[PDB]
């Protein structure tokens, strides 16, 4: 049955480049954000209906960071303005596609093409509370399930922290969020494994006030104001 067309230009400049409908509305309210990364599946044709690329008989979603060109312009304009677990159709001029160059060797130059895009989930870099910059996420690999540990949870981690590219930390532990102190690890870890889902691999990146702060930490030969990167795995949690 048809699919409604309504405000089907979602081209910025408004020169009908990306033409948007929805196959199945999403849930919630929020759409993704810059610099957010965004799992979909997609298949791309042809005008004459030549199947060109799908991530479909794929072992995963094909993930991207929203809004940094990584994709072409079509796809970073309609992304954003889908809910998770809306699946849309677009027509993108060659402008906001592959241009006078194409793509090998399925697509040719100045083409118009058709995506039907599905977004599954996406997912903020910026981890803080109020939203500082304070804790940075760079996913490796996505979790599974939406659970996530909360103030209480025992959880199961591997983690290396970094400073300046140097390893001053990797250990495996069991504990209890909101007892990490104890063990020598920063505020900014803690709630970075807040934010994450099990078996989530994440880089993190913190600034000094989420990391060992004025002071330091003399055990890592952590000098005073230092920003910290780690490696992070969830490995498994049971909340409360």
């Given at each position: 049955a048809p699919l409604p067309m309504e405000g089907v230009d979602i081209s910025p400049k408004q020169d009908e480049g990306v033409l948007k409908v929805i196959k199945r509305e999403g849930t919630?309210?929020?759409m993704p954000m810059i610099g957010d990364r965004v799992f979909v599946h997609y298949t791309g044709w042809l005008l004459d209906g030549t199947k060109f690329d799908?991530?479909?008989?794929?072992?995963?979603?094909?993930?991207?960071?929203?809004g940094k060109g990584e994709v072409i312009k079509a796809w970073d304009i309609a992304i954003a303005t889908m809910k998770v677990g809306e699946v849309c159709h677009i027509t993108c001029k060659p402008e906001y596609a592959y241009g006078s160059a194409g793509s090998p060797?399925?697509?040719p130059p100045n083409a118009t093409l058709v995506?039907?895009?599905?977004?599954?989930?996406?997912?903020?870099?910026?981890?803080?509370?109020?939203?500082?910059?304070?804790?940075?996420?760079?996913?490796?690999?996505?979790?599974?399930?939406?659970?996530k540990p909360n103030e209480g949870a025992i959880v199961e981690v591997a983690l290396?922290?970094?400073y300046?590219?140097?390893?001053?930390?990797?250990?495996?532990?069991?504990?209890?969020?909101?007892?990490?102190?104890?063990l020598d690890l920063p505020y900014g870890?803690?709630?970075?494994?807040?934010?994450?889902?099990?078996?989530?691999?994440?880089?993190?990146?913190?600034?000094?006030?989420?990391?060992?702060?004025?002071?330091?930490?003399?055990?890592?030969?952590?000098?005073?104001?230092?920003?910290?990167?780690?490696?992070?795995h969830l490995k498994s949690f049971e909340k409360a």
């Amino acid at each position: 049955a048809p699919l409604p067309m309504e405000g089907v230009d979602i081209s910025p400049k408004q020169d009908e480049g990306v033409l948007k409908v929805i196959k199945r509305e999403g849930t919630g309210t929020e759409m993704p954000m810059i610099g957010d990364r965004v799992f979909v599946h997609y298949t791309g044709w042809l005008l004459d209906g030549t199947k060109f690329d799908s991530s479909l008989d794929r072992k995963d979603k094909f993930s991207f960071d929203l809004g940094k060109g990584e994709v072409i312009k079509a796809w970073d304009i309609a992304i954003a303005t889908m809910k998770v677990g809306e699946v849309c159709h677009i027509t993108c001029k060659p402008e906001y596609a592959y241009g006078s160059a194409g793509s090998p060797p399925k697509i040719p130059p100045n083409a118009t093409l058709v995506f039907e895009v599905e977004l599954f989930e996406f997912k903020g870099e910026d981890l803080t509370e109020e939203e500082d910059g304070g804790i940075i996420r760079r996913i490796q690999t996505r979790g599974e399930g939406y659970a996530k540990p909360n103030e209480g949870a025992i959880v199961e981690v591997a983690l290396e922290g970094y400073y300046k590219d140097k390893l001053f930390d990797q250990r495996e532990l069991r504990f209890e969020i909101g007892e990490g102190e104890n063990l020598d690890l920063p505020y900014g870890l803690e709630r970075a494994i807040q934010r994450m889902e099990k078996g989530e691999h994440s880089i993190v990146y913190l600034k000094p006030s989420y990391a060992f702060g004025s002071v330091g930490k003399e055990k890592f030969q952590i000098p005073p104001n230092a920003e910290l990167k780690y490696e992070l795995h969830l490995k498994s949690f049971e909340k409360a």
